[PDB]
Amino acid sequence: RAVVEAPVEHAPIGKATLPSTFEDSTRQGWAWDATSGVQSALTIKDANESKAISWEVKYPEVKPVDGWASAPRIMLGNVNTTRGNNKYLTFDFYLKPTQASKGSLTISLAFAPPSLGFWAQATGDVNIPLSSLSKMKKTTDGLYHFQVKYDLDKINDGKVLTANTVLRDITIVVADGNSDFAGTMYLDNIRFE
């Protein structure tokens, strides 16, 4: 299936680049998956004094049965990278809510390794409760700054990412955990470490 809307003015696509820093004012190869429930503009905005890819999302009040249906699902296609000697994949993730009071966001990471059926999903989904935010200190530009980490030795389905396993795509999903989130999201510094 494909989720479609009228042409949207994304920032230039650029070329797949890791670490993804967005400092060339392009998306450095990131784009929505054709199945992403969010297809609005991906632009390069400043977040916490660095350029970051960004989009807007307000999840539906009526929650879909399928937990990824309404989710931003962003992908770095055809990067053909490998983890090397890195234990983690990590990135800066920022929120600028106009509404956030209940439920949570559940952030998942996956890859598409041609040797592993084109899908390998990190086990360690990260949940951000929206009631936690009001007590969290914001950045000077009014964002909530998370550095999210995924242990690449914890993968579903007994699949193993070796140092040399080719990862053709990287996918990040920000799913709605029964939340009332509305606002802006940003990613920066997407890298293995």
Ligand X SMILES: OC[C@H]1O[C@@H](O[C@H]2[C@H](O)[C@@H](O)[C@H](O)O[C@@H]2CO)[C@H](O)[C@@H](O)[C@@H]1O
Footprint of ligand X (CB under 6 A): 35, 66-68, 119, 121
- Write out the binding residues for Ca ion, residues 131-160 only, by CB under 5 A: none
Distance CA 188, CA 49 (A): 11
- Is 92 among the residues that bind Ca ion (CB under 5 A)? no
Residue nearest to ligand X (CB): 68
Q: Which does 50 bind (CB under 5 to 8 A by kind): ligand X, Ca ion, none?
A: Ca ion
Q: Which does 51 bind (CB under 5 to 8 A by kind): ligand X, Ca ion, none?
A: Ca ion
State which of residues 13, 18, 21, 63 lies at the interface with Ca ion (CB under 5 A): 21
Distance CA 161, CA 49 (A): 34
Residue 124 burial class via C-beta count within 10 angstroms: exposed 0-12, middle 13-18, buried 19 and up: middle
Q: Which does 66 bind (CB under 5 to 8 A by kind): ligand X, Ca ion, none?
A: ligand X
137 is in an annotated binding site: no
Distance CA 138, CA 79 (A): 33
Q: Report which residue type is found at 17.
A: T
- Is 91 among the residues that bind Ca ion (CB under 5 A)? no
Which CB sits closer to Ca ion, 33 or 188? 188
Among candidates 170, 161, 127, which has minimal Cα distance to 33? 170
Q: How far is the CB of 94 from Ca ion (least distance, A)?
A: 11
The conformation of residue 65, written as its DSSP 8-state character, comes to S
Give the x/- contact pattern for Ca ion in 39-78, rule: CB under 5 A. Answer: -----------xx---------------------------
Count of residues engaged in binding Ca ion, rule: CB under 5 A: 5
Span interacting with Ca ion, options 32-40, 139-147, 158-166, 185-193, rule CB under 5 A: 185-193
Contact between 86 and 163 (Cβ < 8 Å): no
Contact between 73 and 36 (Cβ < 8 Å): yes
Q: Report which residue type is found at 106.
A: T
Q: Which does 67 bind (CB under 5 to 8 A by kind): Ca ion, ligand X, none?
A: ligand X
50 is in an annotated binding site: yes
Residue 126 burial class via C-beta count within 10 angstroms: exposed 0-12, middle 13-18, buried 19 and up: middle
- Is 22 among the residues that bind Ca ion (CB under 5 A)? yes
Classified as helix, coil or strand, 18 is coil
